[PDB]
Design brief:
EC number (chains A, B, C, D): 4.4.1.1, 4.4.1.11
Number of strands of chain A: 12
Protein name (chains A, B, C, D): L-methionine gamma-lyase
Catalytic activity (chains A, B, C, D): L-methionine + H2O = methanethiol + 2-oxobutanoate + NH4(+)
Oligomer: homotetramer
Structural class of chain A: alpha/beta
Number of helices of chain A: 14
CATH class of the largest domain in chain A: Alpha Beta
CATH topology of the largest domain in chain A: Aspartate Aminotransferase, domain 2
Largest interface: A-B, 75 and 76 residues
InterPro entries (chains A, B, C, D): Cys/Met-Metab_PyrdxlP-dep_enz, L-Met_gamma_lys, PyrdxlP-dep_Trfase, PyrdxlP-dep_Trfase_major, PyrdxlP-dep_Trfase_small
GO molecular function, one term (chains A, B, C, D): pyridoxal phosphate binding
Amino acid sequence: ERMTPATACIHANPQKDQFGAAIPPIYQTSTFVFDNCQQGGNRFAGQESGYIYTRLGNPTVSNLEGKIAFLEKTEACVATSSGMGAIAATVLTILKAGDHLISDECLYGCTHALFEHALTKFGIQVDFINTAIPGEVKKHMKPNTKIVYFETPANPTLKIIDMERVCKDAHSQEGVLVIADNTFCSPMITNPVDFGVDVVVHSATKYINGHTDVVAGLICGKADLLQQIRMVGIKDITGSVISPHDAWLITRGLSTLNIRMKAESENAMKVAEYLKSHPAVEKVYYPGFEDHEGHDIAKKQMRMYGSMITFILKSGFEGAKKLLDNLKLITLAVSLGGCESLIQHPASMTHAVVPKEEREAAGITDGMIRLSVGIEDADELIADFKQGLDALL
Amino acid sequence: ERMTPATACIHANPQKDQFGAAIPPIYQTSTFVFDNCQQGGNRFAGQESGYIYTRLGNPTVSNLEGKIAFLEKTEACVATSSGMGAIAATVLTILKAGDHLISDECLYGCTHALFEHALTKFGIQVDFINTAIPGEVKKHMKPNTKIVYFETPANPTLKIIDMERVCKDAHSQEGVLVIADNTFCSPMITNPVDFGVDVVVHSATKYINGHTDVVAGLICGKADLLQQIRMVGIKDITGSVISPHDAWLITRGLSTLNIRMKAESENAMKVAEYLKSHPAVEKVYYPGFEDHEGHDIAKKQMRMYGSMITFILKSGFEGAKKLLDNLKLITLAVSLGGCESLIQHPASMTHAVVPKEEREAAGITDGMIRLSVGIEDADELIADFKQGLDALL
Amino acid sequence: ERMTPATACIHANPQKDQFGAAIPPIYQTSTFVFDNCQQGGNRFAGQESGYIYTRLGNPTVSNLEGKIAFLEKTEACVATSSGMGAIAATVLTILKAGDHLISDECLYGCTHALFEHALTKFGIQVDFINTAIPGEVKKHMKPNTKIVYFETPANPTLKIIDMERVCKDAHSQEGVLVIADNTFCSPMITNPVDFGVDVVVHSATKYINGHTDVVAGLICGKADLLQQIRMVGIKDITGSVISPHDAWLITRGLSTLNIRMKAESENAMKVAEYLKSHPAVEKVYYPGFEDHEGHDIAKKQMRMYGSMITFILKSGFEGAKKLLDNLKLITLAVSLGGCESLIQHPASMTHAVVPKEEREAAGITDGMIRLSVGIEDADELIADFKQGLDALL
Amino acid sequence: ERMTPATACIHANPQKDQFGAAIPPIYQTSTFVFDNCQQGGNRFAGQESGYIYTRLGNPTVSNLEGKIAFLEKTEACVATSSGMGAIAATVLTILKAGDHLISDECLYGCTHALFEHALTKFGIQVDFINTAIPGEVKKHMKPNTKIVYFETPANPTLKIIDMERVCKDAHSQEGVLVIADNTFCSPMITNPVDFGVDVVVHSATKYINGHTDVVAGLICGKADLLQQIRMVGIKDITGSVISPHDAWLITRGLSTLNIRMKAESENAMKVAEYLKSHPAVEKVYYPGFEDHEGHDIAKKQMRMYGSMITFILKSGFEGAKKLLDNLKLITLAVSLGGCESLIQHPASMTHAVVPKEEREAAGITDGMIRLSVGIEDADELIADFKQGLDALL
């Protein structure tokens, strides 16, 4: 049997340091010395291994990358200095003016604007559609279609998308790449390549680093395509070069990934169920609910049902502000996936950049509240919510 | 009188830390806690100051930014996670399919690829010209021209370009931006806005950090434009987000920037003079030489002549490899601007990515060597060249 | 009710950062600016709060300190740059030539040397006894006795020591301090002040940081005593000043301390049971065994039974080397308490500094192996032991 | 010729990393993996090279150490987590109850209390005398004398001590070790072993790191004595283990040591001379003054006259507070040796811990002001002083 995920977030891609450091050292160096001119020109030509310069590759960054590639069961991984840089380095390597991209319409807010406003201006065409309806991706393909893109569960309604059926329709013509943002599951919950996906991206900012102190992105997929994302999309187009220091912080955060993912998913099931029972609460979205739309597809794709919860209060937006301003243990902030529980209001904060219409066409409402459950004691978490929620009743 | 450069690289844009920390702390945090929901919505809407999320701004990175904006005399500065990222976020926010771009043909290798290959698949038109020749700029101006771009001295030949002349030609038409990559000078030798330039970019991986351990970029210019570059170039298109830990290190490196540039320049003039006298060397390009073409222009534009030297051996390619393989003190690696002296072979190494005819048209021959002098003892530096060179003869 | 341990390792001693940073910043500053001379003189005289100089206190190190003091229920905590430094600063502030010290003979190797060799050249008297035997403490008490010291479970045999009994004997005379090294439990399994202990020390290089990349110590106890240890032990005698960067990393590591200790313990009980059943093993010392001597005491004193296991092979010294040289998943190195499982041979490695008769009197034989279980998959851990062990037979 | 100091703060003790990192990586690891049991027991026995555990030694820390050892022309160097830890690890390895220590009476304030109050309590005898008078060390020796200790120039009056004459008297009986704290000169200004000293210590906090963000100490001297300071004074007594991260910050700061020392010494000569001419100023102490006491000995021992200045205003202590509170570029804080200029009042701040009598017996007055000149533009520095000083007249 393959190393388990639990063992592998600590031991996959073992490094060999010359002094036998238990924890591989930090390669904070912009540049690497050649033994001679012929070796440097050989590396430059892609004909000899070894390092050259940190925008092109770095040993600490490669350690993280081979550990992520193993956990995602992909041939290679390229690390970048933010989830947006991973998204952008991948699609601006693959696309040129005249190509076509299809995307799910419920996306993180900044992915939506990269697709809607920048790819648009570089002559690329995009469709935003609900990729969860059976058949919509095939109805929107054209000869020139190159990428189909989605996030599941989606940020932030937690909509579920049947990846395998999206793939089957996208690969029904040649030359189409399916890209899935797996930030909200992490590689402990889902491996998108299992279902036909070609490329898997992450905001490592969230669960993978898990400690709210690093911004970073990851690209996982085949070696030859990622070699072109490295030499074109990283080298030249985005310049999104992860600091070797932050890469070594994310390997450190990775090694408790499996224990954090289980504990956050167990705490989140308790909290979502508590919330769903409270009288001030109207509606709770959580992929583990049997009444969730796409539950059954979520169960086939997800090993655990995650730590994201989204819910709506019967007091709407003003109720939301009150709950939120009065919480004491839960933290008001954007981002998600850390050890501590965070909460925010997506229409005034993360999805504010997307025009209301476009929000609501996707299902983003003005009363939604988005919660990312940490590893605090579940009863204290429920109790912070009880006190905030009782105050609205 | 303005705070001098030598004081300002330590004291411009002073911080106010609540504990009075002498060295402002490292914000190695991905996100920021709102006091209440309103403040959150306000910050997102640009109505209230404060921090939100490290892809969008962070106090350690603002400190470095305001210190560089002061030193380049610009209203603002945006820091990035590589010099390519500063260039790309800059030109990808400005241009859109259909615009036109004029650049100096002699550029860093990687920028030339971005501009020849990337830009052009995005529907941008590009021409590479000699902006150092009177009239070439105005003759290539087109109605859709948006950027005129160049480096002086140029990488790797050290060509001098008359900034003031290029700017008056580019700005003879409305709506053009002149962008100068000021890496090789640093804000201590040149402030390109003094000459009419509108946007100044840097690879802060070179002299500004000065310690060869950080890869980062900087963008300097008007608040208006740089707010657009921060919300579009950085936030969505490149995702080139600097690590706060690396920003702090650059800030640190920045504080010796004045004494390192003077000491590097002093050393360089001695080493350049020594190379010039040596019978194995055909040519030495240095901006301080009296005969260096554009020496009066170099003199009006540079407070110091820099630590870059480029030279060509009479034995060409095979003599350059021999000399670079027997150097014992000067270090063989790409990059430049560190405390230690570095050297490389442009044609096979930093510019091997440029089709040979383009290198040749810009004067990059295969007998050419590029040297960045650091702060070792100038007599030990000359002695390394003496033994290596005498072994050639 | 008190904030639970599981919440408090993330939220006790909350910080107030001026920008609302989610993760309080790294004060990597040696010194602090006074607003005026008076405030400077006031701070130095203890009349005004604030910071002066990182040998004397730093906000990142106070944050870690107050979080540990909360978790051990002590009024204060002083962090140091190694577990030895916490022990030394502690006992060197208390004692003076002429005092007497009583310690458990089974100690970490290095503490035993400090106490047998260092203390005694300084004119301190020391006796090493079995504090686990009823009456030994009171029988060695002397009028000049100042400290009674011990570790439970002990390093490396896992002897349990009845804290409550040792404290009532030591405190039957006035003026004695009981000091417990709580490293092997961590504040999540045991709070030794609950039992009458007066001073709790840790090697935070072990479970509290939990990631094997930091060497640091902690001292926990009354404000009075620890103010003396900070101004004398730390400031003048040891100079064991923690790096703010390493403090911040420990804080970071601390936030998973609860889920790592539970997961380590769960794993350990399975691995200990497996070793116990194996025909090549003569004996397994684990605190959770029903037959483990002092299992009722271990049970009153520990919330979990820990991840330390010590075992003796029926083949002695030569069988221990063979097994430790063919282990593929468990890592051979000294130290313990990390996410990865570590193992070593006490007699030739952590305790080889102890004259052999003293090791032997404390039960350290040469067939003994010490194991610290981490958070890998328990079935892969047992399978490594199975192949290594079966190769012995 | 030996590598010059200028070249050697960058290139002495060159490291060989397996990937040819231009800047050796950071070994942030508590622990090192053995290839087998026999290798670990061999290292533990001092019979085989390689690493074991970071309290005992670490490759990044060793890089700094060999670079300091080369610049101080000593066989070895041991790095510690504060200057006090270096002082204390050296003298608590060498001394035992019954020994005798002679020290100069003008010392940093915390060295004075370690000698006066802690060594005293561990049965060691100490004499505080003025070691600058010809003959005083010999008059105070006894059979049991083991160490003679001093700082020159002294902190903070800048008193000069003729090291060679102190050595000649201390080595006039066998078994005596001369220890000189060379913090205020740095190895660019003085090598104390030139004059007969056996052991040289530093607060690396000051000039050597040079960037006010690291607390650390260094011990330089023979290999066999430093091997005992490592295995006893570091391992066991002080536990003063430098973080490998801060050691790599101090190597980074080291590489501009020679350019910073020259620039701070040139700026300090200008500033001291300016101060000496101002009408509100009464007395200025600067080793470069020809009327300094011990000038001629300072000239033989010091290559440059340093950046420390101490001066007294005719308005005494209240004048001091006013000047200081009104300075704008100079920073009010303790510590010294950074890139930025710092200033403080030694009797209410650094030497307040020493009883007035003892201060003044040494020459510390209540009007002294102690300044450590950075690398700002000298005219702006003089101008900040002019504006503060004119306000007193």
